């Protein structure tokens, strides 16, 4: 009867959303991965040669400057070198920054959560890794990514007009979202009454007057972090 057909329709939809979540998660994994690779390659080059002349020429290579807003080296002694140039706030110390600390704590590649950029003052995410030469940490290489760029990547398609995608941490922190007002809120703040759980399937919740279906897919291949690709789908539209 109705209930079994209700379930048949629901499972069909969940199957479709699962597919979508999978290949969308892979897409963002692979996009982020190319950037992680540049940072890794850059740090490994610097481990062998970090003279001021090499640092300058390296950070100026177009494969970096056309990929990141800024690419930079923060050294163990606090010295900072960045391309391209920017006005910089007084007091700046790269060793105090989230990207530096996250990279050293991970002992290798990392992605920060959004943090307030020192110069542009906007939220950004950074790919970073320590520069290690024979066990000696010389400093950390970082490359900055705009949140705007990331929302574009995971929202390449509009899911038949059913909804959109966002990024969220395992602890429920919204990292990247089409709605700037939702960024760095938690799932619990956005959904105080009936909070979607990250494990391990599908949830309904109410947003802006409408029932949405939320589904979370792990993003693999992100070193040191546990992030999910979330689909947020208008429920009534989806079943139509
Ligand atoms: C100017 C920005 C620097 C390079 C980095 N994104 C930071 O805020 O620490």
Curated annotation (Swiss-Prot):
Disulfide bonds: none annotated. Residues 3-240 are periplasmic. Residues 7-230 form the Cache domain. It is found in: Cell inner membrane. L-isoleucine binds at residues 92, 97-99, 115-118, 144. L-tryptophan binds at residues 92, 97-99, 115-118, 144. Changing residue 99 to A: Fails to recognize L-Trp. Decreases affinity for L-Ala, L-Arg, L-Thr and L-Pro. 160-fold reduction in AI-2 binding affinity. L-methionine binds at residues 92, 97-99, 115-118, 144. Disruption phenotype: Mutant is defective in taxis toward 17 amino acids, including Gly, L-Ser, L-Thr and L-Val. Mutant also shows decreased chemotactic responses to TCE, chloroform and methylthiocyanate. Deletion of pctA, pctB and pctC abolishes chemotaxis to 5 mM histamine, but significant chemotaxis is observed at a concentration range between 500 nM and 500 uM. The pctABC-tlpQ deletion mutant is devoid of histamine chemotaxis over the entire concentration range (50 nM to 50 mM). Deletion of the gene significantly reduces chemotaxis to AI-2. Changing residue 118 to F: 80-fold reduction in AI-2 binding affinity. Changing residue 72 to A: 260-fold reduction in AI-2 binding affinity. The ligand binding region binds directly to 17 L-amino acids. Belongs to the methyl-accepting chemotaxis (MCP) protein family. Monomer in the absence and presence of ligands. Chemotactic-signal transducers respond to changes in the concentration of attractants and repellents in the environment, transduce a signal from the outside to the inside of the cell, and facilitate sensory adaptation through the variation of the level of methylation. Major receptor that responds to all naturally occurring L-amino acids, except L-Gln and L-Asp. Also involved in repellent responses to trichloroethylene (TCE), chloroform and methylthiocyanate. Also mediates chemotaxis to histamine, but does not bind histamine. PctA has a broad ligand range and responds to most of the proteinogenic amino acids, whereas PctB and PctC have a much narrower range and show strong ligand preference for L-glutamine and gamma-aminobutyrate, respectively. These receptors are paralogs: pctA gene duplication in the common ancestor of the genus Pseudomonas led to pctC, whereas pctB originated through another, independent pctA duplication. This is Methyl-accepting chemotaxis protein PctA. It comes from Pseudomonas aeruginosa (strain ATCC 15692 / DSM 22644 / CIP 104116 / JCM 14847 / LMG 12228 / 1C / PRS 101 / PAO1). The chain holds residues 30 to 269 of 629 of the full protein.
